[PDB]
Amino acid sequence: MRKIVINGGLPLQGEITISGAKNSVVALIPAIILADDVVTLDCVPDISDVASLVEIMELMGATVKRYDDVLEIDPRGVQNIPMPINSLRASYYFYGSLLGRFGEATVGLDLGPRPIDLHLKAFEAMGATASYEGDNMKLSAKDTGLHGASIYMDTVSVGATINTMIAAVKANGRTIIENAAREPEIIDVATLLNNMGAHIRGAGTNIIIIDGVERLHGTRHQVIPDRIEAGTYISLAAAVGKGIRINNVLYEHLEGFIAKLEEMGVRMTVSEDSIFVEEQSNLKAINIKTAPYPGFATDLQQPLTPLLLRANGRGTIVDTIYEKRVNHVFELAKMDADISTTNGHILYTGGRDLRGTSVKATDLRAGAALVIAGLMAEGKTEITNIEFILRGYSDIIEKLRNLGADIRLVE
Template sequence: MKKIKITGNRPLSGEITISGAKNSVVALMPAAILADGIVTLDGVPNISDVDSLIAILEIMGVSVTRDGETLTIDPSGLKSMPMPYGKINSLRASYYFYGSLLGRFGTATVGLPGGCDLGPRPIDLHLKAFEAMGAEISYEGDTMTLKAIDGQLYGATIYMDTVSVGATINTILAAVKAKGRTVIENAAREPEIIDVATLLNNMGARIRGAGTDVITIEGVESLSGTRHQVIPDRIEAGTYVALAAAVGQGVRVTNVLYEHLESFIAKLEEMGVRMTVSEDSIFVEEQGTLKAVNVQTSPYPGFATDLQQPLTPLLLKAHGQATIKDTIYEKRIGHVAELARMSADIEVKGDRIAYQGGKRLEGAEVKATDLRAGAALVIAGLMAQGETIISNVEFILRGYSNIIEKLSALGADIQLIEED
């Protein structure tokens, strides 16, 4: 079993470079199979989610070559086949193959998790969009089949009942080769959606409005290969900026797009964090007294739900008491009990997390309950007095590229260890 071992309370300094966006690349890779030629992605992070997607692509006959941060995808050998059961359920973002396979072949057969309740579920908006474009959906055992009635999807006007990044991207993937015009209303506006639309437009798609709440797609008959640079990961950037404010003595975070982090930076400024924002980097100074603030997540460009947990350890350093409310994922509270094990004064009260800052954290044995909770525990471990052991680190390795090496370079005493 892999674990992360941290000896905390050591000041960090130096420079840390942000990798390509996890939430982009997990959609860009499925998007690549819509092309008739080779797609090359630069800036691909070294994370386990990418490894899982490569395995899925190779099972389907796609040739994938990796050279450092460059991924070359040749879909010429792609076969229309049922998605590999187990692999398709190993990561949530594999559902982007639903849209890309529908767009490419007019059909997709995918495995469902065992015992899945086919009532209300997270992919309802995706399925609603596919049905609006002419796909029929059927179930047999643990398998779901999506199939265009005559092998061809048709453009439609689709209103998203709630703002959903995944459903917006999946609808775009299905619509780029559909006949006619597709209009997505109440679309999500995240930078990762713009990144996917940019790749597809460079392949020959006709997508307008990405980054706004109305996206229009004019279907095309074919898409060609291209080369694409993945945008920097705004969640990784926010995580390391928060870490630098918590335990840094002068840390520069590079390869950052400030405009993707405006609401997060505004909250740090409200706390009193001292930093200098440049064109593509943020220099975080050693901090003085910080102020406790209330945090509430909301869809982009609001405060990102993915940054709620990584910010929490820094909030625990601030003086005063305040609350955190996640309006996107109300049950995103797995980090609370683990931080309490480290002597944090934090608890769940109703629909909010209540915290009292200013209490010193103590090292403990804790477990990552999800990706961003794991990031919070890493930061807390670096802040804490003594030794912290984090289990379930597979969650962390899903989304933070070379995290051990990056933090070690700043002076952190952090190791990835193996235990029976």
């Protein structure tokens, strides 16, 4: 019933403020199950993933108070019951918090490796074995209970690093996560937990040490800015802006992204709190290869692509994290972009005017790509399945209209 309508081809200008990180908050909320008292989060983004997580927490017995950018979560009433969600990668983080709190998790269920296998392997090493007792999966910790272990992650995994860390904070003994993911959201989750009384050291590095504690208390914690939202608006400002200030940005979390934009010839003025993106010219094509942080983020390759389509020359995008993250390509092609995918690889030639038409968001960051492309494109663009965008971009319509975009929510 809902679509986004954009009349593009018009320069944008002004300023936009970045909200708290989707990819921190979706771990922060379930981690709060571990606490003995209320935990309050500030700079909570108004995104659908947060609303869904709030609903689950309430159904599990938490009470949640919400206003402005704040969530007050009281997990004391949380019950040890099967989880009744699953469409969200973040649902996994309940495994770690429920294991940590109750010593067991009864949880909702392709033919090869699945990302979750990494989490379960870590849990198994901490004494929590799995089971398929009938339609559902059961994790249960053994003997004196959940315990520490030295865990080498066969491949780098943000989800498994975070889930292992959450599980470890109330485990018996020390957990050492080797080949840990370094994403700054992992630091944020560790920071929350430490201020709740955990003992986590090395977050942000390849080795994380956790010494299990008896109990966690409450705290009030500001979610780090969303570096992906920030990168999205920087890409947008470069593609169609004539001078836009992006506020609440931490450039230290965008080193790999900023490097590639500078390679293209993007001119921006970087401060400790904000970035001013100039009106751009003479951009040149680059090649993108995603990699674990601090490498170039897989979550940013799609939002960056329409800016690549502005540049002069040809390039390729290779996503080493999610090889088949290419579903924006078929949709961008409908807008007359010179873009294709074989594999695996995404090939583009920039410099062509895009033309608005009806396109469908296929996922969160592909949706963002179509929004930026819609703003660049001549004529009118209509985006359907906008629910994907609303998962991760807070106040997007309002933020963009404030930059002078002709964008509208229709139903």
